[PDB]
Amino acid sequence: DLADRFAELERRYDARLGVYVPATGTTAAIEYRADERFAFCSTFKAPLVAAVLHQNPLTHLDKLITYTSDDVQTGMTIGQLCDAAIRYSDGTAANLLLADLGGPGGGTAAFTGYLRSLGDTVSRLDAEEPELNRDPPGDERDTTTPHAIALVLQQLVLGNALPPDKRALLTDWMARNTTGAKRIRAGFPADWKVIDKTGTGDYGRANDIAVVWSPTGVPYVVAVMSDRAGGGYDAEPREALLAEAATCVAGVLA
Amino acid sequence: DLADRFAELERRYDARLGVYVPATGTTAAIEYRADERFAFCSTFKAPLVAAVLHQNPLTHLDKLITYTSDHVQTGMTIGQLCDAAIRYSDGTAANLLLADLGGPGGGTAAFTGYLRSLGDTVSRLDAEEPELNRDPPGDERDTTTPHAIALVLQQLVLGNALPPDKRALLTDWMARNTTGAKRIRAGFPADWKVIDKTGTGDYGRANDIAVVWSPTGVPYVVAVMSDRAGGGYDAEPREALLAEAATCVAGVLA
């Protein structure tokens, strides 16, 4: 019935839609293709910043980054990179943050390890920007699931994965995100608070992961993922699909 | 007529609009506040990439970025930074390229010097990302003019500021830009080619610089710049102002 409404959205937007909202005390979980794999695209940048915060003292956020270009001091701090990675979905920033995690594969293994540390046994990051938005449909590389990513985001924002000060930094960056106004945010009434991280890619990929707070003060975690493989590489992402999906979710949580 | 239409746009969008289109064989120049200063915002990224290309052999584009704390190789080269800076308007990429061009603290001077070398005596870059989008209205720092930036872009894409292979790289990156669909592109009919670089910032700043080709093969250079200083730091940029301005321009060039 809710399932029937999501199926109608898929029909209307010629798309595959995935939704997960964890249960609360007064609401059942919402799950639609929740264990199907979808490309992360830029949604990984929210947990990425969490990983960097967790692995380092707060002072590290003041570290001005340096690099070498022989197959150099910059004016950029890790904190500035965290801000850019979330609020502007800056890919180069994410690549530098991944490298800051250390380990093999530019930090992709370390990031995947951080997710494992949060009990996410499903998600994987294999490549970095820009390739991670460009895997063909069906490729498991660089994917998560609505279910997986929702439970990660829940621990980060609502749980204890980060101490309070670090948690506040992540929450604020997500709260001031500039890219999500036409996705989950558009589907929830204005008196709900929404913090989010978007993701977009080829094959009509459009994602948004959010923590929303009802007027009554109840937090919910909403993960919506979509793609349009029927259109091939050039399929247009449909933000309005995510907004409409968010509206269905809101109607159930109201 | 045209000046009156731009004035009306300013009134309707509560904004300051600047326009410059160089003359061609069959068309008069278009100029509206063309010599007034506006913040570059990310528009500087196109000339930035030209500067790096000019000062280096094409082999430089293959140089890898290694993040250093004391070494973590990224999957990123100078070429990929060029692609990111222009197509995704990556600020972090721009900052790395500024460092590549002038060294630590020297990129902005090197960039300004490059513009001087192209005969642009007006523009200046003083800060890096993100500060360069944040100067108070009336600060001359980090500004160009529609007139200045149009003539720079003309030399880069249509002139011989760059040798053919380098020129082709810059043109292609601009051609595949993902961020400008609602600005100049939105004002020109679909059978016109549009390559562009956008810029957005605080105080309602929204810019776009483009080279457009008519179906008959005639190139025009279009620079549109806007801000909403009266609304203060948080004023919303209005993309539709740029699209409308572009539509007026297109109607005159058709």
Numbering used by the authors:
A (entry chain A): 29 to 83, 86 to 101, 113 to 145, 145A, 145B, 145C, 145D, 146 to 238, ...
B (entry chain D): 29 to 83, 86 to 100, 112 to 145, 145A, 145B, 145C, 145D, 146 to 238, ...
What does the study report here?
We investigated the roles of three conserved prolines at positions 107, 226, and 258 in the β‐lactamase BlaC from Mycobacterium tuberculosis and found that mutations can lead to dimerization of the enzyme and an overall less stable protein that is prone to aggregate over time. BlaC has 15 proline residues but only these three are 97%–99% conserved among class A β‐lactamases (Armon et al., 2001; Ashkenazy et al., 2010; Berezin et al., 2004). In this study, we investigated the effects of substitutions on the structure, activity, and stability of BlaC. It was found that substitutions in all three prolines lead to an overall less stable enzyme, more prone to oligomerization and aggregation. We propose that one of the roles of conserved prolines in BlaC is to prevent protein association and maintain the monomeric state.
Pro107 is found at the edge of a small loop, which carries the so‐called gatekeeper residue Ile105, important for substrate specificity (Feiler et al., 2013). The crystal structure of BlaC P107T was solved at 1.9 Å with an asymmetric unit comprising four molecules forming two sets of dimers. Overall, the mutant structure resembles the structure of the wild type with an average Cα RMSD of 0.28 Å, excluding the disordered region. However, large differences are present near mutation site. The region around the mutation (residues 94–117), including α‐helices 4 and 5, are restructured. Eleven residues (101–111), could not be solved due to disorder. The space normally filled by α‐helices 4 and 5 in the structure of the wild‐type enzyme is occupied by α‐helices 6 and 7 of the other molecule of the dimer pair. Residues 94–100 and 112–117 interact with each other within one enzyme molecule and with the same stretches in another enzyme molecule, forming an anti‐parallel β‐sheet and stabilizing the dimer. The dimer formation resembles domain swapping, as the region containing two α‐helices in one protein molecules gets rearranged and the space gets occupied by α‐helices of a second protein molecule. Interestingly, the crystals were formed in 50:50 ratio of phosphate buffer with pH 6.4 and malonic acid buffer with the same pH, proving that the formation of dimers is not only occurring at pH >7.5, as was observed in solution.
